[PDB]
Design a protein around this ligand. Structure first.
Ligand SMILES: CC[C@H]1OC(=O)[C@H](C)[C@@H](O[C@H]2C[C@@](C)(OC)[C@@H](O)[C@H](C)O2)[C@H](C)[C@@H](O[C@@H]2O[C@H](C)C[C@H](N(C)C)[C@H]2O)[C@](C)(O)C[C@@H](C)CN(C)[C@H](C)[C@@H](O)[C@]1(C)O
Ligand SMILES: Nc1nc2c(ncn2[C@@H]2O[C@H](CO)[C@@H](O)[C@H]2O)c(=O)[nH]1
Length: 300
């Protein structure tokens, strides 16, 4: 008798209700506010990811998300989760065994590793993979029931998010001015939307052992919206140097750009403070809320 974090009996029963027979080693992440994520071995000798919604309001997202992934599968030259099980109580897919492009121990505030700035294979393949994603036709997104934002709707969403933060929190005056100026700066904003991943950073990108992008995961924020949404974290991790390389190759690979794209991406990155604060507020988590309030009040 040894106490373990995972409830093997309950997990076995849950998986078996959906055609999966668990057998062998498993791993459990409950840091997620909305899902328990288990990597478990099944009787096919293979590891599967069990993505377990915690509550009814999370379960409600499974059906639309499943439609997105089904559409994306043939239209991307890289892997995405294959949700062979997709229901309100359980999503499950064969694990995409390639590593994420950032490795971190659960709970830790410091990664063990991030794919290096000087990895040209990563930089180049991320840029072409991103062009490929952003080339998925709008029609395919509509046919799959995706959330669609025109450029006007995209800008309105940012305005709404800023306004909600301004109502719920006390924000440094310079941040408020920055966001307002951005919202009013016509030349920053794109005149088109594309299919975006929506929560894209190195931790959601898979790479083969040569550091070539081979997949992307965690697609819950996917939608048709401002392309720069998917470039902010690249700027955050790889700096202006990395961003410059990305935009050159992205454009060469057929990605649509506009003159003030680099500027707009930096403003999108600054807007991450809004996204975080609203995440914190909606989470009800007090540690996240404390961090958000401290960030918002602080000068950038
Ligand atoms: C480069 C590695 C680092 O990675 C980053 O900083 C990312 C670019 C960052 O992301 C950056 C950039 C960007 C564009 O998201 C990709 C922006 O929206 C946010 C808020 O911050 C991530 C994705 C954030 O997590 C995102 O927080 C959103 C509020 C919700 C979103 N998801 C669940 C919908 C979630 O993925 C988060 C808020 O940092 C998560 C937080 C709980 C834990 N962090 C503090 C860790 C330790 C990170 O510092 C990191 C892993 O070491
Ligand atoms: N390498 C890999 N990690 C995954 C996969 N699915 C989920 N994860 C991890 O679990 C988290 C939650 O889905 C992700 O952000 C990754 O850390 C996968 O198919 N492959």
């Amino acid at each position: 008798t040894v106490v373990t974090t995972a409830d093997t009996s309950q997990l076995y029963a849950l998986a078996a209700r959906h055609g999966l027979k668990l057998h062998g080693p498993l791993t459990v992440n409950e840091l997620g506010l909305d899902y328990r994520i288990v990597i478990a071995t099944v009787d096919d000798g293979r590891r599967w990811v069990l993505r377990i919604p915690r509550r009814a309001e999370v379960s409600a997202k499974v059906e639309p998300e499943a439609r997105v992934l089904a559409m994306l599968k043939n239209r991307l030259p890289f892997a995405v989760p294959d949700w062979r099980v997709a229901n309100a109580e359980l999503v499950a897919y064969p694990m995409l065994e390639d590593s994420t492009a950032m490795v971190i121990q659960p709970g830790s505030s410091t990664p063990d590793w991030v794919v290096p700035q000087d990895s040209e294979v990563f930089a180049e393949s991320f840029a072409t993979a991103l062009a490929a994603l952003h080339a998925v036709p709008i029609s395919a997104a509509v046919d799959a029931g995706m959330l669609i934002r025109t450029p006007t709707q995209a800008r309105q969403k940012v305005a709404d998010d800023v306004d909600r933060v301004r109502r719920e929190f006390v924000v440094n005056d310079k941040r408020l001015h920055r966001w307002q100026r951005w919202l009013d700066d016509d030349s920053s904003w794109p005149d088109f939307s594309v299919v975006v991943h929506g929560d894209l950073y190195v931790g959601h990108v898979l790479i083969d052992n040569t550091e070539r992008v081979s997949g992307m995961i965690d697609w819950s924020e996917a939608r048709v919206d401002d392309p720069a949404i998917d470039m902010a974290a690249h700027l955050m991790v790889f700096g202006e140097e990395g961003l410059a390389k990305l935009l050159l190759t992205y454009e060469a690979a057929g990605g649509r750009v506009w003159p003030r794209l680099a500027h707009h991406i930096a403003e999108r990155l600054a807007f991450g403070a809004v996204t975080y604060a609203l995440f914190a507020l909606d989470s009800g988590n007090e540690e996240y809320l404390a961090a958000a309030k401290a960030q918002l009040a602080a000068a950038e």
